[PDB]
Design a protein around this ligand. Structure first.
Ligand SMILES: NC(=O)c1ccc[n+]([C@@H]2O[C@H](COP(=O)([O-])OP(=O)(O)OC[C@H]3O[C@@H](n4cnc5c(N)ncnc54)[C@H](O)[C@@H]3O)[C@@H](O)[C@H]2O)c1
Ligand SMILES: NC(=O)c1ccc[n+]([C@@H]2O[C@H](COP(=O)([O-])OP(=O)(O)OC[C@H]3O[C@@H](n4cnc5c(N)ncnc54)[C@H](O)[C@@H]3O)[C@@H](O)[C@H]2O)c1
Lengths: 348, 346
């Protein structure tokens, strides 16, 4: 109890999520930053406080992970870089080999066995052999279209099917996001955009669907997805995009989880600029068909960015406290805000 | 490889709902049914459930079936009070049997019964078993689910939440419990003498939230006012002409440094739709960000509690020994596979 050291965090990746996570860790009593890593030459060497506009014991961003990812130097690394297991696995490996807990936002890491069984097995072996835990989380995947749905099923005698949607407004975002979701394209330019990879859709549905089925004990016979344009019937314009009727207002990603060849789970993530233009309200919508039926909604949707920053930080005690190994949102206690001293949440 | 063996202690609305569910759940078995009601003592549980399965005879002597090795878990669905369920919990735990119970106070027994809670935790750890109180409210929608949403919040100012049902289909017992058809005069008279029970659980819910968030409570305050109809409302068990109490509204206030941080409200009334009132579970978290969640209609209190009790059985078995709350366990989930595959060995 006496002279508990602050939870020591390395933020690894300092883009949008890295920055927000760092700001929050500072603001939280019980946690402190001991390292900041990024490959960005613009950021190399700078004091973290300058990047975020804050006053604290200065931390100097390194492009070299290994002068902070050392044995016993930090409690937990927060890896906010790539979407893909194969691109954060080398970072995860380095962190756990030095006995450092890991939280990552990588969508594929929300349930890595869904698409990377052998790599997920290796993360678990490495985390166990080193006595630390690895968690992938986020708002989606990681919370609203998996963990939250799963929790609701806990009040059901029986679940027939699950249909859920998450709807946002792309209008605050810049050109890079517009191009990821095909805003402004023609339907035909959308198809080649998807087929060549400029249209990103949404990453994480195989992870979310697999997590649900494992949780409920369904055995998947297949996972299908579609990534199709949201063809506008109206005029919509923001500083970074202009869609006229017949042009693509955004991208609708759909995930189908199949049991015995039948759809038990359908997840939808339509992303577009200004859905108010055609009466589409933002929000997270969950419907459970079974005994009983359950219809939940959060309007507007839980903020993708703010929520992922908050959830990442809030899960730090749980990943530290968790038994060693790779963990998912199916293994940890309930998420919760840290309105007290984070040191009190550590199991000693 | 072997079925999860369950004893159901108490066979009322919840007990028989839970037994019927366990019967039809793969990997789960009822090995015993306890109830002191003479109209139930001695009967085949199937006679009560209306089911057609292997006979299980209801005993009123707990010692007949609560003994070392006879069950993995007892499900206690009798009283709302720690005082009244503690002897049952004690018997089951002293025989190495995990416990789940629906008793509202047991959702967070430290709130109002810290010393009893400490002893439950001690007996359970001494006997290598776990104890959990749960339910829809308290136990899920106005505590666990609220807490879960704050986990996406950078910072929480306050929490306000209401759960609204319709007492219409329930009957004379429940009507009198909620003061339906009374007078605002008899209502408070009913509250004082205890004939109007309102809702048990807000201290447990409010305390669970604070402990979860790291808030330190200055105190809990509760009101239990009536709901005066402006309308004629008639069910086969009540008649409420305008001016008379259509139901009871419970409100709980969690105060931190004297300021109100949590307000929970549970208006139970017949036919809320005869005025404008929509049923549902309503949660609003004021902070960064703000979150407004709505479950329409509300999670059915009876059916959801039956389901949640059964679904939590493997998590309580798998939990490490001692008293646990919904703050300690993995996420609730429906059991659509074989419950035996969920049992983890240490
Ligand atoms: N709900 C969710 O699951 C969720 C939510 C938000 C973000 N994400 C994912 O998290 C990741 C981070 O998102 P973001 O908004 O911070 O993106 P971003 O592009 O703003 O951040 C990327 C940063 O990481 C750095 N980086 C990249 N590779 C690196 C490496 N090998 N070593 C060190 N630094 C490296 C880059 O230089 C950049 O500064 C993205 O892949 C995103 O898809 C998931
Ligand atoms: N959300 C929640 O947390 C939640 C929801 C529903 C019910 N509950 C609680 O669970 C309890 C069960 O509710 P219910 O509707 O089934 O009540 P009920 O009155 O319908 O059934 C109670 C049964 O238990 C039996 N019983 C009582 N004391 C006993 C003893 N010492 N030994 C053996 N049998 C005994 C009675 O004979 C009766 O059949 C209630 O106290 C209720 O408040 C909680």
């Amino acid at each position: 109890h006496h002279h508990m050291e602050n939870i020591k965090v390395v933020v690894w990746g300092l883009g949008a999520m890295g920055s927000g996570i760092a700001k929050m860790i500072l603001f939280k009593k019980g946690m402190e930053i001991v390292g900041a890593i990024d490959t960005d030459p613009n950021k190399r060497g700078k004091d973290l406080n300058e990047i975020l506009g804050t006053n604290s014991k200065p931390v100097y961003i390194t492009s070299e992970p290994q002068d902070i990812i050392k044995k016993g130097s930090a409690d937990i690394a927060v890896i906010v870089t790539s979407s893909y297991v194969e691109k954060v696995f080398p970072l995860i490996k380095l962190a756990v080999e030095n006995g450092i807990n890991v939280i990552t936002t990588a969508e594929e890491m929300a349930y890595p066995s869904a698409q990377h069984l052998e790599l997920a097995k290796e993360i678990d072996r490495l985390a166990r052999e080193n006595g630390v835990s690895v968690l992938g989380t986020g708002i989606n995947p990681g919370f609203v279209l998996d963990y939250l749905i799963i929790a609701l099923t806990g009040v059901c005698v029986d679940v027939d099917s699950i249909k859920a949607a998450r709807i946002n407004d792309l209008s605050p975002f810049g050109k890079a996001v517009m191009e990821e979701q095909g805003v402004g394209l023609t339907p035909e330019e959308f198809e080649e955009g998807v087929k060549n990879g400029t249209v990103a859709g949404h990453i994480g549905f195989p992870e979310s669907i697999s997590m649900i089925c494992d949780a409920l004990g369904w055995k998947l016979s297949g996972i299908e997805q579609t990534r199709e344009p949201i063809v506008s019937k109206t005029y919509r314009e923001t500083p970074y995009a202009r869609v006229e009727p017949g042009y693509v207002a955004g991208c609708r990603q759909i995930g189908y989880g199949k049991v015995d060849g039948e759809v038990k789970i359908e997840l939808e993530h339509p992303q577009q600029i200004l859905p108010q233009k055609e009466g589409v309200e933002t929000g997270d919508y969950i419907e459970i068909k079974g005994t009983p039926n359950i219809k939940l909604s959060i309007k507007p949707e839980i903020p993708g960015g703010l929520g992922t920053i908050a959830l990442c930080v809030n899960m730090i005690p749980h990943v530290i406290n968790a038994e060693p190994g790779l963990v998912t949102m199916l293994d940890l206690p309930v998420p919760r805000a840290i309105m007290g001293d984070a040191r009190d949440m550590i199991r000693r």
